[PDB]
Structure 1
Amino acid sequence: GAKPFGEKKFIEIKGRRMAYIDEGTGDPILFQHGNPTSSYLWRNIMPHCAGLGRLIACDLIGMGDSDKLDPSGPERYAYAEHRDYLDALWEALDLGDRVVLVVHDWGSALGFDWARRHRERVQGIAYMEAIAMPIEWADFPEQDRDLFQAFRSQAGEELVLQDNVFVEQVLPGLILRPLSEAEMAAYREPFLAAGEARRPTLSWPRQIPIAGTPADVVAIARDYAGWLSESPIPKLFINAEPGALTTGRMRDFCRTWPNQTEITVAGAHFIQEDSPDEIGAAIAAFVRRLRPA
């Protein structure tokens, strides 16, 4: 379906208005999108968890219905800045101490890091196509390797700010089934205007911890990777076939993580658009196990 889940709420964070879905009651099930997506990514997955908790999906700053940072530029929307806003938002939402995180892409880097820093409050972690550790270019899927190298070059601004390549090329190219007009409209909406409106979708690929750069994100991801590899917190690994980012070495590494259940769904990177019911059913089952009666 193309219809969103629930309706957007807003809250002021560091003076900027952030958007989020917050439906239902009980301990949170916290769904975090990555690039270049929004809370809309989870719209067909969150229904599966009806009744099981407070279903929350925030729009990262500069994304979805969340405000843009102004003045924007190449120094804006780095990992650390997103983390500042998201940490503050999650604090404001009064999540309590039994949170289930459901994460993807940069939502996984942010949620894994948040989990490492707030481990006593994390009841379980479901993740898919995640940034589970620092990688090398050989680990990056071959189909888009050159494109992502170009993003991480001076060519990135034209590709993304001018031509909206992450929304219009990468996103559909990593979804196996055709998207509808309405579905694409929802993904393009935060990024209809050329220029800095699209900067989050360029800053993000520039932040991926690849070949040692940027070193701060490499350090952060090294930290949560080491922690996750030891943590007994229940995990749900939603593996994808063919998948894209969490394949090869990174998948090998994820498969080493303790207390983890794994399912495989059809999909490349944005697997929520290919297998939402399989993914939702798996998450709901995970949460029912974590929250018995």
Structure 2
Amino acid sequence: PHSAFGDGAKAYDVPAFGLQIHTVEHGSGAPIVFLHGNPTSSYLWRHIFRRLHGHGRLLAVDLIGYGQSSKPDIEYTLENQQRYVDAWFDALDLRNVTLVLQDYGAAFGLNWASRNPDRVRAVAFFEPVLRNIDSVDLSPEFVTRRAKLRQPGEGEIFVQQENRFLTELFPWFFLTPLAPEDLRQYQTPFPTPHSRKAILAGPRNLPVDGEPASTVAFLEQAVNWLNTSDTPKLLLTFKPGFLLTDAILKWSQVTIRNLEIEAAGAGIHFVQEEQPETIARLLDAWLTRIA
């Protein structure tokens, strides 16, 4: 694994349905599982992962479609992606799990939790795919681009053939500009048009103004668990943020049970690159409080 994960970290591949899920591990104890979203990998977590050495068995995954994991020719529906996640959790037969979730990592980790309530100790999330989003609350440039990406043809051209999601859109939405070398690591998984397929599935699956309804329905599945579980939960908030709109933040406050909410400073979306010191510190205080 990359050295920024810190000393003593190992990497291996976990088999799932013929494919390989690349995993980065460190240490010992109750497990703490980090799940990224679109279009990142375990690499996004490195600085937080390193600062959290010793709190438990640290486990950062590259989701199918991303990083060093397999990139099969499948439809990247939410239900298909969720199977590979479910498979990874099965192979490792984890219990007492603390989930640390961002973007579609929240969608997949919360949906897993909701069906595996007896295996979950705690959950922290930020900039989540959680709920239907109102288009008026999102960056207008992103909304216009998503609309263009949902068109047959045009999405594939922008994301897969021209690579503009990774060369333009992704680095744009950093508050502090991404270092060249780091932008390069985010692009290494994606040398070809076919390797980029999951990147396009993201914006197409994102629920905006009620569409796609399949995603609103998918995300609704975890809502009963969120609202009724005693499991401790932690939401970190950022100014301005991106996915965590005011309405969604208000919903979370009114609907989610046993939720602590902490401001974590200035950030847009890829907050693990923007505020990794603050995030690791707030996570550390919270894990200690739980312990």
TM-score by length of 1: 0.92
Distance 2:105 2:133 in 1: 17
Unaligned runs of 5+ in 2: none
Residue 236 of structure 1 aligns to a residue whose secondary structure is strand
Distance 1:143 1:24 in 2: 42
Distance 1:80 1:67 in 2: 17
Partner of 2:179: 180
Partner of 1:191: 190
Distance 2:164 2:68 in 1: 20
Residue 209 of structure 1 aligns to a residue whose secondary structure is coil
Which amino acid is 1:225 matched to?
Answer: V
Partner of 1:118: 116
| RMSD after superposition | 1.6
Asked whether the equivalents of residues 77 and 205 of structure 2 are also in contact (C-alpha less than 8 Å), the reply is yes
Partner of 1:79: 78
Distance 1:92 1:213 in 2: 34
Distance 1:214 1:196 in 2: 23
Deviation track 1:25-50 (CA, whole Å, cap 9, x = no partner) reads 11111100000000001000012221
Identity %: 36
Report how far residue 288 of structure 1 moved: 1.4
1:31 aligns with 2:34: yes
* More divergent stretch after superposition (256-265 vs 281-290): 256-265
Report how far residue 67 of structure 1 moved: 0.9
Report how far residue 150 of structure 1 moved: 1.4
| Bigger RCO of structures 1 and 2 (CA < 8 A, at least 6 apart) | 1
Partner of 1:144: 142
TM-score by length of 2: 0.92
Report how far residue 158 of structure 1 moved: 0.9
Asked whether the equivalents of residues 78 and 218 of structure 2 are also in contact (C-alpha less than 8 Å), the reply is no
Partner of 2:16: 13
Unaligned runs of 5+ in 1: none
Deviation track 1:76-99 (CA, whole Å, cap 9, x = no partner) reads 111111111111011112212x11
Query: How many residues align structurally?
Result: 284
Which amino acid is 1:112 matched to?
Answer: L
Distance 2:141 2:236 in 1: 21
Distance 1:225 1:140 in 2: 23
Residue 82 of structure 1 aligns to a residue whose secondary structure is helix
Report how far residue 3 of structure 1 moved: 4.5
Distance 1:160 1:3 in 2: 30
Report how far residue 255 of structure 1 moved: 2.5
Residue 47 of structure 2 aligns to a residue whose secondary structure is coil
Distance 2:3 2:150 in 1: 34
Partner of 2:281: 281
Distance 2:209 2:217 in 1: 12
Deviation track 1:85-144 (CA, whole Å, cap 9, x = no partner) reads 111011112212x11100000000001101111112111111000112123323433341
Partner of 2:164: 165
Which amino acid is 1:55 matched to?
Answer: L
Distance 2:145 2:224 in 1: 29
